[PDB]
């Protein structure tokens, strides 16, 4: 009956869900538990390069804070 | 570098599939259509920068010019219509 | 990590196409009062692999009067575009975060005419060239509205980026407004993908090329429905729940891709002349009118959006 | 062709040169040229015959290549100076490429081979425009940059144009090719005097226009596109000879007639500038234009050729063609030497 | 609803740009000091790199203006690493 | 131009975005704004023959700031001498040029 | 910049060479014309982006529009030539020599 | 009135699409003059600070310009909030 | 012709902030009111006198009066600020729309202790 | 990656050379498509996002498309063209090598002049606002609607009148 197309619908649904959460997790992993910073203009790129330069390990996502 | 990688990967995959495939074993109407499509695609080119034009101060001017564009495009369409350019009855 | 992300993006969409074939067959069967595939595997989940093996194991009878170059680079191009379209899609975070992403979609979609035309010019005949010219004209014509609809709907979010529509629909879908623009967008996706009732090009290739064309077709189907979901049916985005966004996006895209097949089983075909009259006399007037309406709306309303 | 189409095409034909002359931006000048081309082609091809199609194709290709070269010149100047206008600092090669392109747009030699073919394949009211109204924008672009041009190549082009125009008109038996070569010659005179005084280029331009328009109208009176067809004018319409002869002599440049003054004053300026050898060559080779204009004055007004019979019924019929502009322009072009100090 | 939402979006954009405003001075001073130090390093190197050449004034401007002329990124990262040059040119156009 | 109907009617269709020193949309400065401004302001009122000779220092400055041939040549001479010295073993690059330093 | 501009100018020159040298077709000349158009578009956009002169970006757009119109009328003329003779050849336009 | 209204009903029956297109055209060209919320668009797009507000010298005679962001002598767009 | 003039390395040497973008952004709206005068003076020098080499005496004061701000912040009311900018740095556009209540915490804390 | 834009410009050169040499109206279309792809790539390298994507979506998707369309419907491939195609492919090879020698001689004759091979990776970007928003290319191409409305009316009129012109030419 109509409930025999689900074995395929759910397969396709899982295959369509994988990309999103995979990309999100990989971003959080490669960028220090934070989102991947976007750069639509030069100001954000400048902020990013500046964070990278002050890190001391050449990585924009190593936030330093007040301690330094 | 990332876009390059992705497109290269896709091309490689396509060529690999199509290799495995082998290794396992006159009417003027269409021309007029193309021309109309040109004259509308160039209008798209002139129309695309509206998301940046509507951020300006001269709103009374952008309103005007966009209306001019759309109106005269519609008029050209109507004329191509009246003159039996959208018929296909040879 | 990036190559791993690319794999995670590519493999599942191909699996999803291969199983969308089966879903189509089963749905059409149950709408025709029959089952569809049941045997090869439990409920048929092996039939697509069986068909792939069969095709790729056949023997290619390459037309003798032809050109190998245009014979090989047409399906290569089709699949390359059908895969590179899925790249910028925010689901919710994109593999490649582009500005002007919808423009990249427009262009990489409009680039398929070249293959759908080179195949015909390669096949040395006149009937195939007739069919190719007609299909090219159809696709071309509907690209116009496919572009203007977005040109008018991207003024509720002042940017050509796909990662802005999430916050644009953070409170309400872009369907309630522009439901007349969707109804015209939902259809140009059929005619663009030569999908019934706009299949006047498949209603002349070896196993492998036919398979690549099939893959491209169904991939483009899923992607067009995904664009519909992202634009006119903005799903939920709680900053901490990309899982939620992806679940909802999947659900809506499956709804839409099943609607396509609903339609294929429900309606007859069109006649090329009437198909072109449809656009050039019903969709283009309304499209231009609503374009002017949506250029004026953000003005006589103070709701003109930002440029971030 | 319906009124709306006519209006749009002719408004474009009119707007092209107007933008060219009223714009400071070379891009807008180029725009005007493109308008002119786009809106001229359909009128050429109206009849839809092989000859008209071929003429249209030749015109399109030539003018499009020329426009591309002009736009290259503009882009190079833009990369060189940041401005969209030629100054006193542009690499002379840019300006010489521009001059080659403008010369091919006009029809100067050795960039002239297309003009007679096109004019022949084209009807009369279209040759009129092509040879009078389509010389004003490309000449304006030059008038705007006359201080920074190359007299050497300008004079070579002008003298080549004089020579080839004479040696073409000597042979052609077709009204339209004769007019084409006359245009070539007068445009050569213009270019010659340009870098020293452009007011005289404009003088000769208006003189040549006043002299050409009424001639094409005379022809269109009977659609006499040939010598043996215009010879019957003594039986068809003999009240036009007294003026065809005078206008042809003026074109030739005979002293007592308007058409003289251009050559005379241009030679004067060239003498003030010590271009006497070139002025002499040109003045001696204009006599061939005068020759093959006298050969037509003969067959038209000083001797009667064998006529035909149905010309009797042509006499029976009346006519209302030659509007007032014919007489006005012919008089202004034949009897206006006493007013030369004002036209100068 | 779209009007009432995009107006709040405008207010938020103004807030972000105001933060940018408040920050800019710090950034401009830091950038000036950075580029000045870059040019000073390049000069202090050129001094000895080009000592034995004939008729070479060390620090010779190509202008007769006497005023400040912002340097080119080529001038700055010309003696530095090619990866630095590539980050300067194809660094923002290459998706973060 | 050839027919100053624009200046007659006191309007501007094409004569406000000709050169670099003109008005840009969001006040964004162009590269050679000051050099071109100076050249124009100094050549205003003496047009042509004079400005080609007694307004030439400023045109040279504009040409250099726009085309940069002299700067290119300078940097190239420096790099050539440096390559020769490194090849022959009479000079070594410093750390910040080699690729390592303490940044700001 | 210098190198890419030199190569762009060489390409324009090559396409003009192709135009001035026919090879029995006419499409192969219209395509050279469009190559010229493309080279000029690219050079103009590149100079605009190099100088940061955002008051000159409409120029590529305009020239693209007008090149499109020129190409359209050229294609129409070619279509008529084919409709009449049977080929987009150039030896068939031997008329007007009399 | 009668003849033209019958024409409009004939249209409304035959080609509703053309009617809707033309009516949307008219609405677009007309409503921006009726609406009161129009001016606010230019007001906002002016109020957006994409650039640095370069200050000026306190040369004495300038009482209607503040010396600190938090003074009421300058403009204040509370109307945006109230919007 | 003309020997360019530059400043030495001993100078243009100052205690930088070494603080990150999210932090500067969480502290901007207060750093725009406090420490405004010595910022406007510098952004007037740098625009009147087009040379940066003529505003180092002002850029150093900028850095100093910014360190004093970030030192007041540490002395009093460090934890709300820490959590606020930690929540900010999570996003990509570093948006103020998600961290609205931690911002109220920072604001109340600073308004009470300062 | 210093050689990036140089490689792109060289590919554009080779495409325009394969145009100059005239294989056929279809392989010429393919050459045009390649050259346009490369032109967009180099425009993006120079920062022209909008310009390059517009090239993509209009020049290729709109112009070369109708070029190939009109070609197929109004052109016939004759058998002779194949031997001559191979001949002009060899011609193309020879031209490539001649261009290489040309570039070598020009580098030998002008170090910092025609092409600064030493400074290849340099002299691509001269200046840029680092802390600046609102400096993309759309901000300029959208000037048309506020300043330079003259260009917009010009272009719209060209397109408008093209309709009448083409209907009258084809008819
Ligand atoms: C034999 C079979 C042949 C079939 C081949 C078919 C291949 C076609 C594949 C589809 C074509 C895709 C077109 C790619 C255009 C990229 C447009 C784009 O948006 O990239 C711009 C990118 C980001 O810039 P932006 O978004 O403006 O802002 C970023 C600031 N954060 O900034 C950048 O510029 C990124 C660098 C550009 C990368 C583009 C590379 C595209 C893929 C290259 C394909 C090469 C194929 C082989 C050669 C083709 C023929 C010569
Ligand atoms: C003062 C200072 C001097 C300055 C230098 C002066 C330059 C020289 C002046 C040259 C003026 C004439 C030159 C052109 C000669 C024209 C030849 C001509 O018209 O005669 C031929 C023709 C004969 O026609 P046919 O068929 O033989 O029989 C008569 C029927 N009309 O004749 C015709 O058919 C004519 C048309 C008939 C119209 C009816 C008759 C009305 C009169 C028309 C002729 C007017 C001529 C005016 C002469 C004034 C001379 C100054």
Numbering used by the authors:
A (entry chain a): 1 to 68
B (entry chain A): 1 to 25, 51 to 115
C (entry chain H): 1 to 203, 214 to 318
D (entry chain N): 1 to 344
E (entry chain Z): 48 to 143
F (entry chain e): 1 to 104
G (entry chain K): 1 to 98
H (entry chain b): 1 to 83
The article reads:
Mitochondrial complex I catalyses the first step in the mammalian respiratory chain, electron transfer from NADH to CoQ (ubiquinone) coupled to proton transfer across the mitochondrial inner membrane, in order to generate the proton motive force (Δp) and drive ATP synthesis by oxidative phosphorylation. When Δp is high and the CoQ pool is adequately reduced, the driving force for reverse proton transfer across the membrane is sufficient to drive electrons backwards through complex I, from reduced CoQ (CoQH2) to the flavin. This reversal of the normal electron transfer reaction causes a substantial increase in complex I-mediated production of superoxide, which is then dismutated to H2O2 by Mn-superoxide dismutase in the matrix, and termed here “ROS production by RET”. Furthermore, mitochondrial ROS production contributes to the tissue damage associated with cardiac ischemia–reperfusion (IR) injury.
In stark contrast, WT-CI, prepared by the same method, is observed predominantly in the A state, with a 30-min, substrate-free incubation at 37 ˚C in vitro required for deactivation. The ND6-P25L-CI and WT-D structures match very closely overall (RMSD value 0.59 Å) and reveal only subtle structural differences in the vicinity of the mutation itself. When the π-bulge is formed the upper (matrix) part of TMH3 rotates, relaxing the helical turn; conversely, destruction of the π-bulge during activation tightens the helical turn. Notably, the upper part of TMH3 contains two bulky aromatic residues, Phe67 and Tyr69, which adopt different rotational positions in the two states. Steric hindrance to the rotation, from these and other residues, likely explains why deactivation is so slow in the WT enzyme. The resulting loss of structural integrity in the CoQ-binding site explains why the D state is catalytically inactive.
